[PDB]
DNA sequence: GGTAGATCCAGAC
DNA sequence: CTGGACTA
């Protein structure tokens, strides 16, 4: 899921989890828990804890308990659900919080590939993975001005600045594509070679971009099919080692 | 320090 | 071969 998708599961999940307390944690893939180390720590700690609320940062989630937060990233196929204790689990059902009302929030993640860290509330946010996270797309935080400072200060491509969870918030490969298509800007240029005037433009489609999103495609994925501005065939190349979709004619 | 390469997975290829 | 976010 991709931000706009992580912040749906945000809103819906918190009403489906929030007051229940948590009696079980089982892993069924232990390297998913990345702290603590220990998948048995992990599980321990979180026993007894009630669910308090439930946040974004990018593409990460934050569930607040009593004492501590979870973190966790759903990568590429990563999915939460609410269901009964009573009931088989569905595939690929890696981690499961059973509740003392006789429900579960589980994970399944079919890939493997997604993450969940827990720390005391407070160390939640200066440690990883939010430690150096940067600031929200749709946050004034995330200003041409601050766009315009890291991108005079690299040798990377444009692309390759985008998808810098530093540099911003959980901005996905689908978005960049599209934003630097809706920006005419070719997503291989130098990102340092981007004028101010470039930079502008390229903000206000990175927040127009994801901002419809949080509320049809150009270039992502249509390779071999016209432009739907020019008429163009759309390519596909690979840039900052990423499948890369983009117009010839549009893009500069 | 900056930046590329290294890496985990399993399904599609 | 592919994706997001420690090591050298
Ligand atoms: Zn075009």
């Not at 009403?15 to 089982?26: Q, S």
């Not at 939460?80 to 981690?95: F, G, I, M, R």
């Not at 935080?141 to 890291?150: D, G, I, K, Q, T």
């Not at 690979?238 to 549009?250: D, E, F, L």
Request: glycine share 8%; net charge positive.
């Amino acid at each position: 899921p991709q931000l706009p998708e992580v912040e749906t599961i945000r809103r819906t999940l918190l009403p489906l989890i929030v007051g229940k307390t948590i009696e079980d944690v089982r892993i069924f893939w232990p390297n998913i828990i990345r702290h603590p180390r220990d998948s048995e720590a992990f599980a321990a700690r979180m026993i007894g804890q009630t669910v308090r609320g439930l946040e974004r940062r990018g593409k990460f989630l934050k569930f607040l308990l009593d004492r501590d937060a979870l973190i966790s990233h759903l990568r590429m196929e990563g999915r939460y659900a609410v269901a009964s204790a009573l009931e088989p689990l569905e595939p690929h059902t890696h981690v499961v919080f059973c509740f003392t009302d006789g429900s579960e929030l589980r994970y399944r993640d079919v890939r493997k590939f997604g993450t969940m860290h827990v720390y005391a509330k407070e160390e939640a946010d200066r440690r990883p993975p939010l430690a150096e996270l940067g600031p929200e797309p749709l946050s004034p935080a995330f200003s041409p001005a601050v766009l315009a400072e890291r991108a005079v200060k690299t040798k990377r491509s444009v692309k390759a600045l985008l998808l810098d969870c530093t540099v911003v918030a959980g901005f996905g490969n689908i978005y960049v594509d599209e934003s630097l298509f809706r920006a005419g800007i070719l997503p291989g240029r130098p990102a340092a070679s981007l004028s101010s005037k470039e930079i502008e433009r390229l903000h206000e489609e990175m927040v127009a971009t994801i901002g419809e999103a949080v509320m049809h495609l150009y270039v992502y994925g249509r390779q071999g099919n016209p432009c739907k501005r020019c008429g163009t065939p759309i390519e596909k190349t690979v840039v900052a080692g990423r499948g890369t979709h983009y117009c010839p004619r549009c893009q500069r």
